[PDB]
Symmetry: C3
Subunit: 90 residues, 3 copies
């Protein structure tokens, strides 16, 4: 009955990204200091986790989206979302 979220942040402003799994879809809300807005990330999933790291000022985000026993990694490296190499044998 309740949605499931994952959050990450970086720098001191900060920037924040909050991912929500709702009815099989994961969407993203974003803060960069002046208001929340809807982000580009939109992929299937019933469960989400996230981690991120900086290289200098460049953010790198990895979102782990799961449906059933299948987890797909999605990558942001400054220039759009792409599927990552992660696999598991769940």
């Amino acid at each position: 009955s309740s949605v499931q979220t994952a959050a990450t942040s970086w720098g001191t402003v900060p920037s924040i990204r909050v991912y929500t799994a709702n009815n099989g879809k994961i969407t993203e809300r974003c803060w960069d200091g002046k208001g929340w807005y809807t982000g580009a990330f939109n992929e299937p999933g019933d469960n989400v986790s996230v981690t991120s790291w900086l290289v200098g000022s460049a953010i790198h985000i990895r979102v782990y989206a799961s449906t059933g026993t299948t987890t797909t990694e999605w990558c942001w490296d400054g220039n759009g979302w792409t599927k990552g190499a992660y696999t598991s044998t769940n």
Copy 2:
């Protein structure tokens, strides 16, 4: 099962673990010298958290969800306040 979320900062470290249990989220805290129950108390069934340092000051954001509504709670050095977060 209960649902948890964890964050940490520095090198001591400090850790905060948030647990959703039967619609209530509570907080356990480590600052190097034993666990204790923190001030955070808010309703929710699922929880996530992030935190960042500004120099030596910690800032924490906890995202508490009930049904389709997620409420953000903010620690900025003196109590927890409702944040600007909204979602559709």
Copy 3:
């Protein structure tokens, strides 16, 4: 139903650890720059969260595994996983 995951990362390679809870078993997949591999972590739980911090170049990881209302902390401090003092 779906598996439930938690993730942490460190440094600039980076290293990543992803924990998956699946029918009461939590396992770990690891990235250190050249491929994913299955890590040493194997503990029971229906829910998992994680946090980590560097002390110099040394990674320290805390995984919070829950079954019912009992959360167990598992600690990586450089040479295997040990149970932690976290209580709630």
